[PDB]
Amino acid sequence: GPSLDFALSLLRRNIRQVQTDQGHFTMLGVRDRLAILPRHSQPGKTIWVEHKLINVLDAVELVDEQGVNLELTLVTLDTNEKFRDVTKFIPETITGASDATLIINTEHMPSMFVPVGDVVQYGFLNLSGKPTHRTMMYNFPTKAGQCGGVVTSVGKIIGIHIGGNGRQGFCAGLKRGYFAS
């Protein structure tokens, strides 16, 4: 079906299993050699991607216009070829959704689909003693090991999972402008 094929195609073409020194994460490749990680993955000069070590050419820990953490790291990778460009599926402004699917892809949780439900604008979040802006929330008890997971709804890629508190899950909202050249 259309939504199942979209999620499965994202898994195949854009959503990679990675390892850093901080463990297992999911990584969305967005276009060209640009990918996005949760900040707390703390990528070094190399990152394990699926089956090989990939050099990290740049890493930008994103902050807002007031300098508050957004809990996202934008990595430029020394990859052979370009990621299929999925920027057109990312909204221009941080937008919630109804009945979203969270897509996890690590060695421990490969090709995993999680029905998180409605995703709403949340804003400020204190995540592990790191204040964070531009978050959205879902009332779903997500678990450890799901950071970097891709929040999706009806052909839209809206957020990257950054944590939870046992009853709720939180993502960093995505804006298309983060990925402009």
From TrEMBL:
Question: Which family is this sequence assigned to?
Answer: Belongs to the picornaviruses polyprotein family.
Please state every residue range assigned to the domain named Peptidase C3: 1-179
Q: Which GO terms describe its biological process?
A: proteolysis; symbiont entry into host cell; virion attachment to host cell
Read off the InterPro entries from this record: PCV_3C_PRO (IPR044067), Peptidase_C3A/C3B_picornavir (IPR000199), Peptidase_S1_PA (IPR009003), Peptidase_S1_PA_chymotrypsin (IPR043504)
Q: What is this protein called?
A: Genome polyprotein
Gene Ontology MF terms in the entry: cysteine-type endopeptidase activity; RNA binding
In which domain of life is the source organism classified? Answer: Viruses
Q: Which UniProt keywords apply?
A: Capsid protein, Covalent protein-RNA linkage, Host cytoplasm, Host-virus interaction, Hydrolase, Magnesium, Phosphoprotein, Protease, RNA-binding, T=pseudo3 icosahedral capsid protein, Thiol protease, Viral attachment to host cell, Virion, Virus entry into host cell
**Pfam families, alphabetically?**
Peptidase_C3
What is one cellular component GO term in this UniProt entry? T=pseudo3 icosahedral viral capsid
Subunit architecture: Interacts with RNA-directed RNA polymerase.
Compartment(s): Host cytoplasm; Virion
